[PDB]
Scaffold this active site. Structure first.
Site, PDB file in Angstrom:
ATOM      1  N   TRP A  83      42.431  69.007  24.426  1.00 35.58           N
ATOM      2  CA  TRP A  83      43.691  69.101  25.130  1.00 35.58           C
ATOM      3  C   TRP A  83      43.444  69.552  26.574  1.00 35.58           C
ATOM      4  CZ3 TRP A  83      46.870  72.383  20.889  1.00 35.58           C
ATOM      5  CH2 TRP A  83      46.936  71.690  19.687  1.00 35.58           C
ATOM      6  N   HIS A 122      42.183  61.065  27.499  1.00 29.63           N
ATOM      7  CA  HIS A 122      43.437  61.735  27.698  1.00 29.63           C
ATOM      8  C   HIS A 122      43.266  63.161  28.243  1.00 29.63           C
ATOM      9  CE1 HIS A 122      41.811  62.734  23.421  1.00 29.63           C
ATOM     10  NE2 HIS A 122      42.242  63.957  23.680  1.00 29.63           N
ATOM     11  N   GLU A 162      44.133  51.272  22.494  1.00 34.50           N
ATOM     12  CA  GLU A 162      43.539  51.506  23.778  1.00 34.50           C
ATOM     13  C   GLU A 162      44.595  51.902  24.768  1.00 34.50           C
ATOM     14  OE1 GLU A 162      41.465  47.882  24.848  1.00 34.50           O
ATOM     15  OE2 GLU A 162      39.973  48.214  23.349  1.00 34.50           O
ATOM     16  N   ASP A 175      47.647  59.585  28.042  1.00 35.53           N
ATOM     17  CA  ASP A 175      46.625  58.514  28.029  1.00 35.53           C
ATOM     18  C   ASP A 175      46.306  57.981  29.402  1.00 35.53           C
ATOM     19  OD1 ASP A 175      44.965  57.284  25.850  1.00 35.53           O
ATOM     20  OD2 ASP A 175      45.666  55.443  26.950  1.00 35.53           O
ATOM     21  N   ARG A 204      28.119  63.462  24.085  1.00 42.44           N
ATOM     22  CA  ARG A 204      28.823  63.063  22.882  1.00 42.44           C
ATOM     23  C   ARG A 204      30.191  62.693  23.465  1.00 42.44           C
ATOM     24  NH1 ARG A 204      33.892  63.979  20.131  1.00 42.44           N
ATOM     25  NH2 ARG A 204      33.575  63.548  17.889  1.00 42.44           N
ATOM     26  N   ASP A 206      34.088  61.603  22.891  1.00 42.75           N
ATOM     27  CA  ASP A 206      35.265  61.579  22.076  1.00 42.75           C
ATOM     28  C   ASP A 206      36.097  60.290  22.239  1.00 42.75           C
ATOM     29  OD1 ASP A 206      36.992  63.480  20.174  1.00 42.75           O
ATOM     30  OD2 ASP A 206      38.560  62.662  21.612  1.00 42.75           O
ATOM     31  N   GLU A 210      39.523  54.317  21.693  1.00 46.43           N
ATOM     32  CA  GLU A 210      40.744  54.396  22.517  1.00 46.43           C
ATOM     33  C   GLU A 210      40.515  54.005  23.943  1.00 46.43           C
ATOM     34  OE1 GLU A 210      39.944  56.905  19.989  1.00 46.43           O
ATOM     35  OE2 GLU A 210      41.623  56.591  18.904  1.00 46.43           O
ATOM     36  N   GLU A 230      31.953  58.302  19.740  1.00 45.63           N
ATOM     37  CA  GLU A 230      32.683  58.471  18.482  1.00 45.63           C
ATOM     38  C   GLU A 230      33.657  57.298  18.331  1.00 45.63           C
ATOM     39  OE1 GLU A 230      36.337  60.418  18.398  1.00 45.63           O
ATOM     40  OE2 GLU A 230      36.212  61.082  16.205  1.00 45.63           O
ATOM     41  N   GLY A 234      35.136  53.287   9.427  1.00 39.92           N
ATOM     42  CA  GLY A 234      34.103  52.957   8.437  1.00 39.92           C
ATOM     43  C   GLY A 234      33.565  51.539   8.524  1.00 39.92           C
ATOM     44  N   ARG A 344      37.064  74.326   9.449  1.00 33.72           N
ATOM     45  CA  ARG A 344      36.688  74.941  10.750  1.00 33.72           C
ATOM     46  C   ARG A 344      36.420  76.469  10.725  1.00 33.72           C
ATOM     47  NH1 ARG A 344      40.187  71.094  14.880  1.00 33.72           N
ATOM     48  NH2 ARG A 344      39.328  69.187  14.023  1.00 33.72           N
TER      49      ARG A 344
HETATM   50 CA   LIG Z   1      43.272  55.041  25.984  1.00 36.28          CA
HETATM   51 CA   LIG Z   2      37.971  62.541  17.929  1.00 34.71          CA
END
Ligand SMILES: [Ca+2]
Ligand SMILES: [Ca+2]
Length: 476
Positions: A83, A122, A162, A175, A204, A206, A210, A230, A234, A344
């Site tokens: 965030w 984002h 996306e 976004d 890495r 995220d 998207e 990422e 599957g 977590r």
């Molecule tokens: Ca996007």
């Molecule tokens: Ca994620």
């Protein structure tokens, strides 16, 4: 570090907020269901580096580092780092910029690497997409850099995926419009400077699904280090093609099938074996994939079965198949957390017990992997071959002829039952001398070319030339 050099690494993934405290407490309360900051810092990591390094990891992956939204909501707080609001600042809850640079130096000083989680997709906002106040963002203070508000309603629709926004109505995820030249510029400078200021070794990424794929090549190139994305899905047919624009992807295709093959004595081995073959066919370099059996977004392996032999087997697999092994902090302690946020749990509540069953297993597995790599320079890049399977077993070979490591996996469980399996197909000849590294058992191949493998309590078995083991101290 570049992708080719990352291949020989082993990574420990931890949540900055959940791993360790600056005050070194082992008792600080952390109710997960509450979804608030429990207090982990970059100094708390530095403070417990011996703990990490004793399992033989060479690298760590940490949460995102940018300043987040400061509010508390029914969606919880930004303790995960996903965030962000001001990208040129740090998450003051984790520490200061100096602290982040000291983590980097402390690691490098031990022969260890730093991997950082980054979010190109984002921004975070405590309010619904209609009422976003763009004045809180830095530098994206204009609704102009963002895509028009829409929620992702239909996941088969890749454009929608996306272009619409992740999140809900409590915390929306504004976004970015990543096709815009101004937003590519900001982001390419941003990642070159991130790497250069904190000396990062790898990234890495995220939410790769998207973002449009053409964003990635100039981003991989501006950062100057390995990038693993990422793509949370599957299907190898959906996530392998990204390997065309990134370097590597996290191995979500294998994840699902490994999980089920090993959760029970009746889990499907066929399913695993077929997925090996599908990924090798769609992915250009499976050895550049990030292998995992648990992470911060799905239930812990111990939530499905609490059998230790099953647990050992998924761990041998991540380390000894094709790709880079990644252990999720807690795994080594047999954490049982389910659905998010239950998965977590703070690591500090375990007391950092370095004598936990799985702590030891990973340390031995890491030694083994390092020995194989040291002995055959063509080992790490050699494609894995699953050469034998039965209803409860899979045997795999990797490495140069005359030198290959043989890995034998079983989903029978602790119940086990000692027997010897005569593994055919290894490519080794009659009279070759091997040593099973986990038991230090010496075996000779058959006149027929068979390996008599001693099986017990459904535990993994790994064999290497005796010659090699004899050059180490895996076996005294
Ligand atoms: Ca996007
Ligand atoms: Ca994620």
């Amino acid at each position: 570090l570049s992708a080719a050099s990352w291949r020989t690494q082993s990574i420990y993934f931890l949540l900055t907020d959940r791993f360790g405290r600056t005050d070194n407490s082992t008792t600080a309360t952390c109710n997960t269901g509450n979804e608030i900051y429990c207090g982990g810092s970059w100094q708390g990591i530095i403070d417990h580096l011996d703990y990490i390094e004793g399992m033989g990891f060479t690298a760590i992956w940490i949460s995102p580092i940018t300043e987040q939204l400061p509010q508390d909501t029914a969606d919880g707080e930004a303790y995960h780092g996903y965030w962000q609001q001001k990208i040129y600042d740090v998450n003051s809850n984790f520490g200061t910029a100096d602290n982040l640079k000291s983590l980097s130096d402390a690691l490098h000083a031990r022969g260890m690497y730093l991997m950082v989680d980054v979010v190109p997709d984002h921004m975070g906002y405590a309010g619904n997409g209609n009422d976003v106040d763009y004045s809180v963002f830095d530098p994206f203070d204009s609704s102009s850099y963002f895509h028009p508000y829409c929620l992702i309603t239909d996941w088969d629709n890749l454009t929608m995926v996306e272009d619409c926004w992740e999140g809900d109505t409590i915390v929306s995820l504004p976004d970015l419009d990543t096709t815009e030249t101004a937003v590519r510029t900001i982001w390419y400078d941003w990642v070159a400077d991130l790497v250069s200021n904190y000396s990062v070794d790898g990234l890495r990424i995220d939410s790769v699904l998207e973002v449009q794929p053409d964003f990635f090549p100039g981003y991989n190139k501006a950062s100057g280090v390995y990038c693993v994305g990422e793509i949370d899905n599957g299907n190898p047919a959906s996530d392998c093609p990204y390997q065309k624009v990134l370097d590597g992807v996290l191995n979500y295709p294998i994840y699902w099938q490994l999980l089920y093959a090993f959760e029970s004595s009746s889990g499907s081995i066929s399913n695993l074996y077929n997925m090996i073959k599908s990924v090798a066919s769609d992915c250009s370099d499976p050895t550049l994939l990030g292998n995992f059996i648990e992470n911060h977004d799905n239930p812990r392996f111990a939530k499905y079965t609490s059998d230790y032999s099953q647990a050992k087997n998924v761990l041998s697999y991540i380390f000894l198949s094709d790709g880079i092994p990644i252990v999720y902090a807690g795994e080594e302690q047999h954490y049982a957390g389910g659905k998010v946020p239950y998965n977590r749990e703070a690591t500090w509540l375990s007391g950092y017990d370095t004598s936990a069953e799985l702590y030891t297993w990973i340390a031995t597995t890491n030694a083994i992997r390092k020995l194989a790599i040291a002995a055959d320079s063509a080992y790490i890049t050699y494609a894995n071959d699953a050469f034998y399977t039965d209803s409860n077993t899979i045997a795999m070979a990797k490495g140069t002829s005359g030198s290959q490591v043989i890995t034998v996996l079983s989903n029978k469980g602790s119940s086990g039952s000692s027997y010897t399996l005569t593994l055919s197909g290894s490519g080794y000849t009659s009279g070759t001398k091997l040593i099973e590294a986990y038991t230090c058992t010496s075996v000779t191949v058959d006149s027929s070319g068979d390996i008599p493998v001693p099986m017990a309590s459904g535990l993994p078995r790994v064999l290497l030339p005796a010659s090699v083991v004899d050059s180490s101290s895996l076996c005294g």
